[PDB]
Each structure stands twice: as C-alpha cells, then as structure tokens.
Amino acid sequence: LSSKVTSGAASQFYPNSIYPSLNVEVVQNLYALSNPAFSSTVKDESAIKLAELQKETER
C-alpha cells in the first residue's frame, strides 16, 4: 500500500448535518508509518578508504 483515501458520505445521514452532500476526498501518504526511521583521522590510505566504503553504503 501507498496511500489512504477517505470518504465522508455519511454526513448526509448525520442528524442536524452541517455538511450535507460532502462530495470531496482527503488523501494521506503513508511513508512515515511504512518506515518511521526515514528521518534518521590523519590522511592514511586505510581510514579514508573505509570512510569511502561506508559513504558508498550509506549512499
């Protein structure tokens, strides 16, 4: 799943309805619920290579 839709058709049936015939639609994305964690050395020839590989992985 990617999105959630709503539909307020029951406002016509609601008593003392302030919103009769509410023909609109709300759509909300879901990537936070699907992935809450989305928000988140002397120039040697070894440590800089390690940093490069770690950066590639994170990339």
């Binding site: 590989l53 770690q54 992985t57």
Partner: protein
C-alpha cells in the same frame, strides 16, 4: 660505513597505522549492503532486547 656512530631512530620510527582499518575495509568489500543493513537491524534489536 659510520652507521654505528649515529642515532637515526628518529629518522626511522614505527608507523602509527592501524591494520584494523584495512581489516574492516576488506570485510566491507567482501560483504554486501543488505547484510550491513541487517547488522544495523541486529544492533537495533539488541538495543530493544537490552531495554526489555
């Protein structure tokens, strides 16, 4: 020829290189990325295990 009458220990010192960096580098080069993310999951689940 006059090597005995000198002190070049400062001219020649042992390097401060950590071989662990080359070892972890060869480990990352051998491993794939999904295992790295799995290891991040193992660490997170271990954190929750220590929490509970």
């Amino acid at each position: 020829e006059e090597c005995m009458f000198k002190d070049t220990r400062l001219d020649v010192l042992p390097p401060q290189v950590n071989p662990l960096n080359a070892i972890l580098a060869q480990h990352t080069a051998q491993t794939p990325v999904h295992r790295s993310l799995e290891k991040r999951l193992w660490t997170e689940v271990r954190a929750t295990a220590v929490s509970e």
